Amino acid sequence: MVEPMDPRTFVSNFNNRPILSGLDTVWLCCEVKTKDPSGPPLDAKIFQGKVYPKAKYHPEMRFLRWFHKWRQLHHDQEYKVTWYVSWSPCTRCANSVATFLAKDPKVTLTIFVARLYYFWKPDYQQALRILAEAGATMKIMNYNEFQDCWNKFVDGRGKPFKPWNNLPKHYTLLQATLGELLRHLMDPGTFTSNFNNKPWVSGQHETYLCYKVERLHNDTWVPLNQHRGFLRNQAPNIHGFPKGRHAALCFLDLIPFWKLDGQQYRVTCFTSWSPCFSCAQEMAKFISNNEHVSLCIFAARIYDDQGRYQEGLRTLHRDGAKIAMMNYSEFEYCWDTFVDRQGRPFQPWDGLDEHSQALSGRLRAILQN
Amino acid sequence: NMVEPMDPRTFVSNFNNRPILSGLDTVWLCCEVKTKDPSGPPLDAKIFQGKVYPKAKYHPEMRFLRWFHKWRQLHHDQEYKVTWYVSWSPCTRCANSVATFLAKDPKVTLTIFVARLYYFWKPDYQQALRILAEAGATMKIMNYNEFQDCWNKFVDGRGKPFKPWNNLPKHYTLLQATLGELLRHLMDPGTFTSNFNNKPWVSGQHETYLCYKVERLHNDTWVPLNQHRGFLRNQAPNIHGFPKGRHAALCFLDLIPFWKLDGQQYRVTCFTSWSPCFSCAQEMAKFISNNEHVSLCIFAARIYDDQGRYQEGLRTLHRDGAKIAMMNYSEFEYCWDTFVDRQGRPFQPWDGLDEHSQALSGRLRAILQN
RNA sequence: CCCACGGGAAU
RNA sequence: CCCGUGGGAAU
Ligand SMILES: [Zn+2]
Ligand SMILES: [Zn+2]
Ligand SMILES: [Zn+2]
Ligand SMILES: [Zn+2]
């Protein structure tokens, strides 16, 4: 029940390169469903509009007009709406959609965007935050979403979705950027489970890495209040990174995307695991070629990778990176800054300062040998 | 005018002069007919197209022949000069059919500019070019002036001027040298004497002529690679070619990778009228550096004082494995017999040959042992 | 045209 | 869609 879009149209418009000129149109594919996700789609429509402001002709506004009509022809139940948009919404449309969502708790909306539109201009940032604040889930389109869009909205003729190169690289950059803009906070239980520095008797291997950037201004380190969030490692996926991507590598990918100048910058990261050998070798390689950027790496635990991890940590120290185990100081900072604590002060786990001292000694042992 | 012009997208993709270029299964042939008078107007102009495959019923050369036979009988009998721009060089069958045509018609002379050489490594298409040149056809590679002239007379340009693609002169260099090899171009005897006389250069003219040959190692024999030997000169600076010029030693280095030599030991010999400058010798050193299966013999008629670091370059070149020697009567007779259009005449040495040869040989040692 | 890479701070 | 490269040994 969709007049599908040309496959040539989809490939050029849903290309998720974060910086991409020449696309003057916003494409919005949408579905309507019931409370039950398993059920079939009630309706589906495609909307297009030009980017520059005669803003009531953006596809977000056209959906609102169509949806009001469509609602008055259907019975009142709970509806789940999904958008695939080539560009994130403008400041005006975000308000108008936020307006809509408040007057209608029967409707919940999830927005998958391919690219972030003007993610560096603070107008469009508030547009996204206002939209999430009004209840809308806001995610970046990934392979599964691009393929699902190709299936339902594109005149593919049975031809399969074929991803472009650098699709996961772009998803990485855009997801972290959205996390920064929306100020995604870590779940408080998640932080405690992964940053407790007692010996790891558990089976879950995942790495969470918090990051912040400061600039040297006069003799003070001034926070770049725009570049701080957290990220975790990418599970292996044939439709993404086939061998996974460790959190240290995704963090290295972000730094060039920030477009930092030649000034003095200090990038601080708090990782639940010390890097393995290959990740530490890439980080050392980085500060090697960027001596205007210093790098402070605090780790909650030392990752024994059953390999050359001790050599990687030494390589990291010899090349200018600060390497230290997190003490109570850092654990409280991460709690207060990156966790969805909601007032609660930092509640230390048992043996924090003791495990912290023990790891600090073991880390020195690695570096002085 | 009286041409149904071709789409500019067609011209840009089809007349691209990259020597190795797949995906172009069509031969485009733009041709003009003119009179004895060069100033005179074009009588008629036509575009012909045909498929590349040897089985295609009418290659564009054959379609021209049929069209010209009709067109001739509608015009009075005079002398005609025909010009072709062809995206691909001709096959052997069309070459014979055109060669047959020109012999039975001395009133017609034909010049063929090709954009790319088709199968220049297979002796069929090589023989095709020699068949055609021998029957009187001028055979040249298209350069900037021709690509532009083709764009003006045959292309639906919409007033927009011809805009050359990148590496047009890089490609032209390779294709021009290849054609000279295939057609067995020989040097003009006056040019050879003027540039290789080893007396002190009292003239103002600085240009470099460089002869080249390849030898192959078989057991302990240097067996001539009788397929890659010719001559070339340095490219003067031109905004529509190499804007900063191209020294002849560099054009010689460009050829060697294009030859696609095997892993065997190969010795590429060159006889240059001038010793390399410092930067050219430094590039030659870089080459023998990165190719230790290829050795390099450089014989020079005269030592080039470049008002710079040339003596260091000559020292670096001899150290890194390249042989450097001055041409003696030995070498001068070889180059005359091999690369010059002598037509029987034996080598007549200029005055003071061996003396200038010995005098420069001493000056070269002085460079090498200091 | 086929393949790979880089770039687009984006009416 | 635009720009800059590299590769086409050539149905
Ligand atoms: Zn808008
Ligand atoms: Zn790692
Ligand atoms: Zn033919
Ligand atoms: Zn030179």
Author numbering:
A (entry chain A): 8 to 142, 147 to 380
B (entry chain B): 7 to 142, 147 to 380
What does the article say, verbatim?
Human APOBEC3G (hA3G) is a member of apolipoprotein B mRNA editing enzyme catalytic polypeptide like (APOBEC) family, and is one of the most effective antiviral host restriction factors against exogenous retroviral pathogens such as human immunodeficiency virus type 1 (HIV-1) and endogenous retroviral derived remnants on the human genome. hA3G is a DNA/RNA cytidine deaminase converting 3′ target cytidine (C) in 5′-CC-3′ or 5′-CCC-3′ motif to uridine (U) within single-stranded DNA (ssDNA)9–15 or single-stranded RNA (ssRNA). hA3G has two cytidine deaminase domains in tandem, the N-terminal CD1 (or NTD) and C-terminal CD2 (or CTD). The ability to bind nucleic acids and form oligomerization is attributed mainly to CD1/NTD (referred to as CD1 hereafter), while deaminase activity is performed by CD2/CTD (referred to as CD2 hereafter).
Complexes with RNA1-AAxtal and RNA2-AAxtal were determined as two different types of dimers with two rA3G molecules binding to one RNA molecule at 2.90 and 3.10 Å, respectively. In both dimer models, there are no direct contacts between the two rA3GR8/E259A monomers, which is reminiscent of A3H-dsRNA complexes showing RNA-assisted dimer formation. The dsRNA8 has a G-C base pair (G8-C1) 5’ to the bound AA ssRNA core (5′-A9A10-3′), with G8 (in the sequence 5′-G8A9A10-3′) making five hydrogen bonds with S28 through its base/sugar moiety (bond lengths 2.5−3.7 Å), including two that are guanine base specific (carbonyl/amyl groups of S28 peptide backbone with N2/N3 groups of G8, respectively). Additional five hydrogen bonds are present between the side chains of R24/N176/N177 and the phosphate backbone of C5, G6, G7, and G8 of the dsRNA (bond lengths 2.8−3.7 Å). When in complex with 5′- or 3′-overhang dsRNA containing unpaired AA dinucleotide, RNA-mediated rA3G dimers are formed.
